[PDB]
Amino acid sequence: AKPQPIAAANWKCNGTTASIEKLVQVFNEHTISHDVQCVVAPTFVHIPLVQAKLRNPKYVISAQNAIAKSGAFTGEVSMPILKDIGVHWVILGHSERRTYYGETDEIVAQKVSEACKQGFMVIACIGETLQQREANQTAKVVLSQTSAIAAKLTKDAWNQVVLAYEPVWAIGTGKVATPEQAQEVHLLLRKWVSENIGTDVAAKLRILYGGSVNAANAATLYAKPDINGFLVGGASLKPEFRDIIDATR
């Protein structure tokens, strides 16, 4: 009944040629025997290296960010440029970009809309801060983030969308959400999608959890009915990513 799971490696701003070659070999030698979409998101400058070395058939390569259009945007990489180089997945609205790099709900929504129009699969990130959770604002926050994205999408565009719920207080902190905490948010997100977008859209939508996922906590998170896989930061730089993938069996 669950849709196809996703196991996504957000390498963030990390890697050398040598370390990437070693880790890609690890990923290649791990034979995956179930239906799962694996994703690796290296830094922009490492995309060609990963494209040349990654051969595991369960994997696609994703960018960690993009802007919508080419032009006079020194330092940025656009969606047409990624498409031309063969990258058709992108992570958008990651908490680090919302916090450090000026990505408001509306800016994220515009990027997601443009990526969908350009044929990308999009991992769109949402999630509340510790302060918002303590103020009992978790649902209002994640639904505001999601509805801002939804307002710029047609119903058919949702076939390209994957949501990643990452409580900000769980990102890199060693304080993973409990299975109950994660499931509660995934449930309310799917209910909103069901009632506002469509029951069919909601049944097919992948909602991933991220924030301190590791190989030992992944299977119990995946056992929850509304969790469809993981967006993985620190543990995706390590060979234990193999067991995180296999925790989606």
Author numbering: 2 to 250
Please share text taken word for word from the publication where this structure appeared.
The catalytic power of TIM is thought to stem from its ability to facilitate the deprotonation of a carbon next to a carbonyl group to generate an enediolate intermediate. Glu167 is thought to act as the catalytic base in the initial, rate-limiting proton-abstraction step to generate an enediolate intermediate, which is further stabilized by other residues in the active site.
Elegant studies by the John Richard group on the protonation state of the Glu167 side chain show that the pK changes from ∼4 to ∼10 when forming a complex with PGA, mimicking the protonation event of this glutamate upon substrate binding. The structures show that in the PGA complex the postulated general base Glu167 is protonated, while in the PGH complex it remains deprotonated. The differences between the room-temperature structure and the 1.19 Å resolution structure of the perdeuterated protein at 100 K are also small, with an all-atom r.m.s.d. of 0.12 Å. Moreover, none of the residues in the active site show any significant geometric changes between the room-temperature and 100 K structures. The atomic resolution structure of LmTIM with PGA shows a hydrogen bond of 2.61 Å between the carboxylate group of the inhibitor and Glu167.
